[PDB]
Amino acid sequence: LEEMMTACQGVGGPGHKARVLAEAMSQVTNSATIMMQRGNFRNQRKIV
């Protein structure tokens, strides 16, 4: 058995847990992008 995929699933290596992270960090950082945006909008469309 090519148990590389079995290992790289969370039990040994992340491999997919790395993809779950990638999903979440994109989303968490995006959620903070909404905070930046919640400033770079309010202030903006003025005298800028």
Coordinates of N, CA and C in Angstrom, one line a residue:
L1 N 0.8 -1.2 0.0 CA 0.0 0.0 0.0 C 0.9 1.3 0.0
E2 N 0.5 2.2 -0.8 CA 1.2 3.5 -0.9 C 0.7 4.4 0.3
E3 N 1.1 4.0 1.5 CA 0.7 4.6 2.8 C 1.2 6.0 3.1
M4 N 1.7 6.6 2.1 CA 2.2 8.0 2.1 C 1.0 8.9 2.3
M5 N -0.1 8.7 1.5 CA -1.3 9.4 1.6 C -2.1 9.1 2.9
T6 N -1.8 7.9 3.5 CA -2.4 7.5 4.8 C -1.7 8.3 5.9
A7 N -0.4 8.4 5.9 CA 0.4 9.2 6.8 C 0.1 10.6 6.7
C8 N 0.2 11.2 5.5 CA 0.0 12.6 5.2 C -1.4 13.0 5.1
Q9 N -2.2 12.7 6.2 CA -3.6 12.9 6.4 C -4.0 13.6 7.7
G10 N -3.0 13.7 8.6 CA -3.2 14.3 10.0 C -2.5 13.4 11.0
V11 N -2.4 12.1 10.8 CA -1.9 11.1 11.7 C -0.4 11.2 11.8
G12 N 0.3 11.3 10.6 CA 1.7 11.5 10.5 C 2.0 12.9 10.1
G13 N 1.9 13.2 8.8 CA 2.0 14.5 8.2 C 0.6 15.2 8.1
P14 N 0.5 16.5 8.0 CA -0.7 17.2 7.8 C -1.3 16.7 6.4
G15 N -0.7 17.2 5.3 CA -0.9 16.9 3.9 C -2.2 17.4 3.3
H16 N -3.2 17.2 4.1 CA -4.6 17.7 3.9 C -5.0 18.6 5.0
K17 N -4.5 18.4 6.2 CA -4.6 19.3 7.4 C -3.9 20.6 7.0
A18 N -2.9 20.5 6.1 CA -2.2 21.6 5.5 C -3.2 22.4 4.6
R19 N -4.0 21.7 3.9 CA -5.0 22.3 3.0 C -6.2 22.9 3.9
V20 N -6.5 22.3 5.0 CA -7.5 22.8 5.9 C -7.0 24.1 6.6
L21 N -5.7 24.1 6.9 CA -5.1 25.3 7.4 C -5.2 26.4 6.3
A22 N -4.6 26.1 5.1 CA -4.6 27.0 4.0 C -6.0 27.7 3.8
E23 N -7.1 26.9 3.9 CA -8.4 27.4 3.8 C -8.7 28.4 4.9
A24 N -8.4 28.0 6.1 CA -8.7 28.8 7.3 C -7.8 30.1 7.3
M25 N -6.5 30.0 7.0 CA -5.7 31.2 7.1 C -6.1 32.2 6.1
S26 N -6.5 31.7 4.9 CA -7.1 32.6 3.8 C -8.3 33.3 4.4
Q27 N -9.2 32.6 5.1 CA -10.4 33.1 5.6 C -10.3 34.0 6.8
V28 N -9.3 33.7 7.7 CA -9.1 34.4 8.9 C -8.4 35.8 8.6
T29 N -7.4 35.7 7.7 CA -6.8 36.9 7.2 C -7.7 37.7 6.3
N30 N -8.7 37.1 5.6 CA -9.7 37.7 4.9 C -10.6 38.5 5.9
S31 N -11.0 37.8 7.0 CA -11.8 38.4 8.0 C -11.2 39.7 8.6
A32 N -9.9 39.7 8.7 CA -9.1 40.9 9.1 C -9.0 41.9 7.9
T33 N -9.1 41.4 6.7 CA -9.1 42.3 5.5 C -10.4 43.1 5.5
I34 N -11.5 42.5 6.1 CA -12.8 43.1 6.2 C -12.6 44.2 7.3
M35 N -11.7 44.1 8.3 CA -11.5 45.1 9.3 C -10.7 46.3 8.7
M36 N -9.7 46.0 7.8 CA -8.9 47.0 7.2 C -9.9 47.9 6.3
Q37 N -10.7 47.1 5.5 CA -11.7 47.6 4.6 C -12.7 48.5 5.5
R38 N -13.0 48.1 6.7 CA -13.8 48.8 7.7 C -12.9 49.9 8.3
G39 N -12.5 50.8 7.4 CA -11.6 52.0 7.6 C -11.3 52.5 6.3
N40 N -10.7 51.7 5.4 CA -10.4 52.0 4.0 C -11.7 51.9 3.2
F41 N -12.7 52.7 3.6 CA -14.0 52.8 3.0 C -14.7 54.0 3.7
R42 N -14.8 53.8 5.0 CA -15.3 54.9 5.9 C -14.6 56.2 5.7
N43 N -13.3 56.2 5.8 CA -12.4 57.3 5.5 C -12.5 57.7 4.1
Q44 N -12.4 56.7 3.2 CA -12.4 56.9 1.8 C -13.6 57.5 1.1
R45 N -13.5 57.7 -0.2 CA -14.6 58.3 -1.0 C -14.9 59.7 -0.5
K46 N -13.9 60.4 0.0 CA -13.9 61.7 0.6 C -13.0 62.6 -0.2
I47 N -12.1 63.2 0.5 CA -10.9 64.0 0.1 C -9.7 63.1 0.3
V48 N -9.5 62.2 -0.7 CA -8.5 61.2 -0.7 C -7.9 60.9 -2.1

